[PDB]
Structure 1
Amino acid sequence: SASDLNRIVLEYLNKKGYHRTEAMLRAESGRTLTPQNKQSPANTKTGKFPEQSSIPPNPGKTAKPISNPTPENYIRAYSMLKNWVDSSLEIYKPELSYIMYPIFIYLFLNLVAKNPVYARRFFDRFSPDFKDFHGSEINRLFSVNSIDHIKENEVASAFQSHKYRITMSKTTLNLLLYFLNENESIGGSLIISVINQHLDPNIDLKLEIQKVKESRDAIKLDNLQLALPSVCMYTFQNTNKDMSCLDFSDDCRIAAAGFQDSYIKIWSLDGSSLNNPNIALNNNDKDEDPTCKTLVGHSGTVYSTSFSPDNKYLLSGSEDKTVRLWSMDTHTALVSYKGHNHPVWDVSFSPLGHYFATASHDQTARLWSCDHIYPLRIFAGHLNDVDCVSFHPNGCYVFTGSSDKTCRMWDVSTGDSVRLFLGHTAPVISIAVCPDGRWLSTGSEDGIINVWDIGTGKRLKQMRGHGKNAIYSLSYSKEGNVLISGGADHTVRVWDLKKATTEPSAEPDEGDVTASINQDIKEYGRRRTVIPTSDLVASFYTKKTPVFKVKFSRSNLALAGGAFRP
């Protein structure tokens, strides 16, 4: 019945106004896979930050995924070098203490010529640190605010003629060049241009930077190999089956668990005070602080909870038809958010922390904002209710999975669905999109993960190692593609995303004994057992506690979390 669907598609295009060549080319564009973007997480050499321009996102001014290929102000470009030399009381400290002054002076003198108010920010931001080292010269540089003010100060006008000399060693010059080459587009190239055009280094410089870039290009890692992560498991003990899904913050200092009796429980994962004294020390050591704070603002059971990337606010979604906001440094409620008439099941912040999306029983997802009490977009189009919600890592699309065996990608501005992904056989329960952004992964309640690509919309492959049960959470490797799935069968499994695709991801050159005999025992029967894909590599069981949360930290250490069940 798929050839008849192809004929219905062709007649739909013919009646909806696509030329025969145009429909053939749109079919050929729909069939081929999304190619590889080499700047996939935007590596810090050729990648830029997002603009902070106070406008909402817009997925327009944008070409297709099928086609092949793919200002930066002075204060942050100096603060990068400032913090990099400030993080070191090493053997190379006072040479950076020497060379930190004329780069600041030349950046200030090159920034007064373009933007005066940014220059007034930049001067007084980094003023009082070397005043005792460089005398009243910075007091002489108070009266420079324009191009004609530079002609008043004779040393500032001489700084264009007198190139500032500095005698630098070879190891310090190579350290500075290999630091300012490893991140160009933050401002390293802007520092390098000032160093090349205004400084006098004692030991041509363009050939030196060419040799730096060529020797840095001569040794890289082209195709990455897999790595098995270390999992730290947080097991919660005295929860009599009344602890819903939990979450960890970033820096992993706070854990938030939503209870069935309308509390949010807040744990300091370091054993810290979690009282935020802030030197006031007024009174009340008479209370009992077990390094754990409770939050009582809900009247229903808390079904989801999400932490801001700022990590100072908590967002709790309940079955009373509100989502509440909590301050993590005074432990009270701030804002109630009322836009649903059914229970709330999955709240999730943006990547940049701008605005949060919500899932509920009313078959619609809702886009919000943390400063608006009522919603901003309604995501309608599912047949059953929405279970999970997640953004694209740029904060520009929304992904919602629902209990009618499908998930959708929504435009965040126009509201209408852009992708519909079909192929599952159970309620989609957890969804996650890779830091590359070209591949979407989700897990159902059938114990089957699968990955599609967002350009073609069809299935690359699936993952068949979990038990016929729920896949509660999902997490991604920070750099590259290794999927960590914490489900309901008490295991945390590890998945290679790049086995059966056109990207093989650098297999080893040269055997085992345990491989292909563990599921060749099959004592329970062939039809009554699971057979794993070739993508599953490892599986860590937890001994009778289930894993509600997997959270892959920055440094190849994942954290799992759950409650000790009996």
Structure 2
Amino acid sequence: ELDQLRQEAEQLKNQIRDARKACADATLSQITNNIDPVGRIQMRTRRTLRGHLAKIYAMHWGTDSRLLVSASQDGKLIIWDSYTTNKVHAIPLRSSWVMTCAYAPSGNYVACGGLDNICSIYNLKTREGNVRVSRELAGHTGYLSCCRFLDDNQIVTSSGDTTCALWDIETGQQTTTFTGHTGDVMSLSLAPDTRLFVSGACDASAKLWDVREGMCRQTFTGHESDINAICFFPNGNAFATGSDDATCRLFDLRADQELMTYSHDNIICGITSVSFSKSGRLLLAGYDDFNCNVWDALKADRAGVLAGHDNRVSCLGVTDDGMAVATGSWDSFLKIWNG
């Protein structure tokens, strides 16, 4: 009974591992060996946004690459104009423990959530002009850790109750529940076509989910500690993860295995955030040691370092046009980088 199912699971795992080993022929570094290295990356703080009173936990760029929203653990959701440094909105929150925020691709909504287990939707552009809560999504039994809009009516949320969910904002009800993780789910990343999405969890495993189907397709391992950050490659066929064991990895969906590892000997702090560039050549990652390290996605060579934050770097974003890079930190400052 139990022994039979344990043996069946062991055989299935052995078959999966054997298939992965068989498909492994050459490494990414071996193929990317004659490529000319990028060199060195010079990026300077072009803007610095102030106004948050406490630690900043999240930020999110708009699709126009000009506006961005940020979240602080003081109950504020501030919308910025990155070109002119002006503040467009300042939305006070009911709960003071926000841990994530999002920007609707249409630009009419911003989301929010945290320790209150609620995802709050805010109406930005309305005939009245003021900003008010449109919906409140309840049903998770753990803290909201990430949320990503698909359109003006659908949103995917991840929670510390080992479950991701897909919602319908118009009705306020869950549509699909994604189960299978054993630890808290920490991060989300939507595919470019919004047809799939990956999530990282505290059980050191990542999973690829089918939005319209609701089932787990592929499961990726390799990290030894909790996975804090996850991001898709611009192609849409690969993704990157950041973890507490001070390493970053690149996984290929089609090859179904890890390709590269981004680590260094003088790095012992965990990764808080991770992102890519427009071409996918650079892999920007935030760290607990107060700075951001720019990597080379094809050679694992550190192209540069972004320094200037007094405290821990918590969030990190890259514009849709590739123009600028924004980072938030626990010192309550948003710094925009370019170069």
**Range class of TM-score, shorter chain:** 0.7 to 0.9
Deviation at 1:410, TM superposition (A): 1.4
Distance 1:475 1:354, change over 3 A: farther
SS of 2:293's equivalent? strand
Residue 492 of structure 1: aligned partner: 292
Asked if 1:269 corresponds to 2:261, the answer is no
Q: What's 2:303 paired with?
A: 537
Instruction: Determine if contact 1:234/1:559 at 8 Å carries over to the other structure.
Output: no
> d(CA) in 1 for partners of 2:10 and 2:68?
53
1:326 paired residue number: 122
Look up the SS of the partner of 2:235 in the other structure: coil
Equivalent residue letter for 1:364: T
Q: Matched residue of 1:356: which SS?
A: strand
Which amino acid in the other structure matches residue 57 of structure 2? S
Q: Give TM-score scaled by structure 2 length.
A: 0.79
Counterpart amino acid of residue 23 in structure 2: R
SS in 2 for 1:548: strand
Matched, 1:31 2:23: yes
- Cα distance in 1 for partners of 2:248, 2:60 equals 21
Q: Which residue of 403, 412, 426 maps to 2:202? A: 403
Letter in 2 for 1:540: L
- Determine if the alignment matches structure 1 residue 355 to structure 2 residue 121: no
Aligned partner of 1:304 in structure 2 is 100
Q: Report how far residue 480 of structure 1 moved.
A: 3.7
Give the whole-Å Cα distance in 2 for the aligned partners of 1:544 and 1:300: 23
Matches within 5 A, 1:221-300: 226=38, 228=41, 230=43, 232=45, 235-237=48-50, 239-271=52-84, 291-300=87-96
Q: Is the 8 A contact 1:297 1:333 kept in 2?
A: no
Amino acid at match of 1:461: M
Counterpart contact for 1:238–1:564, Cα < 8 Å: no
2:143 corresponds, among 337, 343, 346, to 343
Per-residue Cα deviation, 1:99-142 (whole angstroms, up to 9, x for no partner): xxxxxxxxxxxxxxxxxxxxxxxxxxxxxxxxxxxxxxxxxxxx
1:354 and 1:29 map into 2 onto residues whose CA distance is 42
- Please give the per-residue CA displacement for 1:413-471, whole angstroms capped at 9, x wherever unaligned: 33221111111011101101101122221001222101111123222121114732232
Letter of the structure 2 residue corresponding to residue 365 of structure 1 = C
- Using a 3 Å threshold, how does the CA distance of structure 1 residues 545 and 237 change in structure 2: closer, same or farther? farther
Which residue identity is paired with 2:235? Answer: D
Cα deviation 1:342-391 (Å, max 9, x = unaligned) = 221111123x6663211111110111233331111111111111000112
- 1:557 alignment partner, SS class: coil
Assess if the C-alpha contact under 8 Å between 1:232 and 1:558 holds in 2. no
Report the CA distance between 1:398 and its aligned residue. 1.8
Matched to 1:335, the amino acid is: R
Could you tell me which residue of structure 2 aligns to residue 314 of structure 1? 110
- Structure 1's 535 and 343: CA in aligned 2 closer, same or farther, altered over 3 A? same
Aligned-pair CA distance for 1:33? 7.2
| Greater share of residues in helix | 1
- Matched with 1:85 is none
Q: Which residue of 2 aligns with 1:174?
A: none
Alignment of 1:132-151 (within 5 A): none
Q: C-alpha distance in 2, partners of 1:324/1:243? A: 18
Change (3 A) 1:243 1:439: closer
**Secondary structure in structure 1 of the residue aligned to 2:271:** coil
In structure 2, the gaps of 5 or more residues are 1-6, 29-34, 333-339
1:199-218 matches, within 5 Å, as none
Contact 2:56 2:331 in 1 (8 A): no
1:547 to 313, 321, 335: 313
| Aligned with 2:163 (options 364, 368, 381) | 364
User: Equivalent residue of 2:303, what SS?
Assistant: strand
Q: CA deviation at 1:546?
A: 3.8
**Distance 1:490-1:250 versus aligned 2 partners, 3 A rule:** farther
Aligned to 1:464: 263
1:444 equivalenced with 2:243 (yes/no): yes
Deviations 1:206-238 (A, max 9, x none): xxxxxxxxxxxxxxxxx8974747454654556
Secondary structure class of the residue paired with 1:336: strand
| Cα distance, 1:29 vs structure 2 | 9.9
More strand per residue: 2
Contact 2:59-2:316 at 8 Å conserved across structures? no
Superposition pairs of residues 97-176 of structure 1, within 5 angstroms: none
What is the CA-CA distance between 1:299 and the residue it aligns to? Answer: 3.0
- For residues 484 and 390 of structure 1, the distance between their equivalents in structure 2, rounded to whole angstroms, comes to 15
- Contact in 1 for aligned 2:291/2:308 (Cα 8 Å): yes
Using the alignment, how far apart are the partners of 1:244 and 1:257 within structure 2?
Answer: 8
Residue 420 and residue 265 in structure 1: after superposition, are their counterparts in 2 closer, same or farther (change >3 A)?
same
Secondary structure of 2:181's partner? coil
Give the aligned residue type for 2:291: T
Superposed CA RMSD in Å reads: 3.3
**Equivalent position of 1:523 in the other structure:** none
Separation in structure 2 between the aligned mates of residue 410 and residue 560 of structure 1, nearest angstrom = 28
The alpha carbon displacement at 1:11 in A equals 5.2
Contact 1:365 1:386 in 2 (8 A): yes
Q: Which runs of no fewer than 5 residues in structure 1 stay unpaired?
A: 1-6, 15-22, 37-222, 274-290, 500-533
The structure having more radius of gyration, on CA atoms, is: 1
Q: Is the contact made by 2:20 and 2:256 (CA closer than 8 Å) also made in structure 1?
A: no
CA distance in structure 2 between the aligned counterparts of 1:497 and 1:272, rounded to whole angstroms: 31
The alignment's TM-score, normalised by the length of structure 1, stands at: 0.49
Distance in 1 (CA, whole Å) between partners of 2:277 and 2:251 is: 17
Distance across 2 between alignment mates of 1:431 and 1:550 = 12
Change (3 A) 1:455 1:310: same
The one-character-per-residue Cα deviations of 1:472-494 (angstroms, maximum 9, x if unpaired) are 22221212432111233222222
Describe how 1:45-84 pairs up with structure 2 within 5 A.
none
1:478 aligns with 2:244: no
Aligned 8 A contact 1:312 1:328 in 2: yes
Write the distance in 1 (CA, Å) between the matches of 2:319 and 2:282.
13
Within the candidate set 177, 182, 186, 1:378 is matched to 177
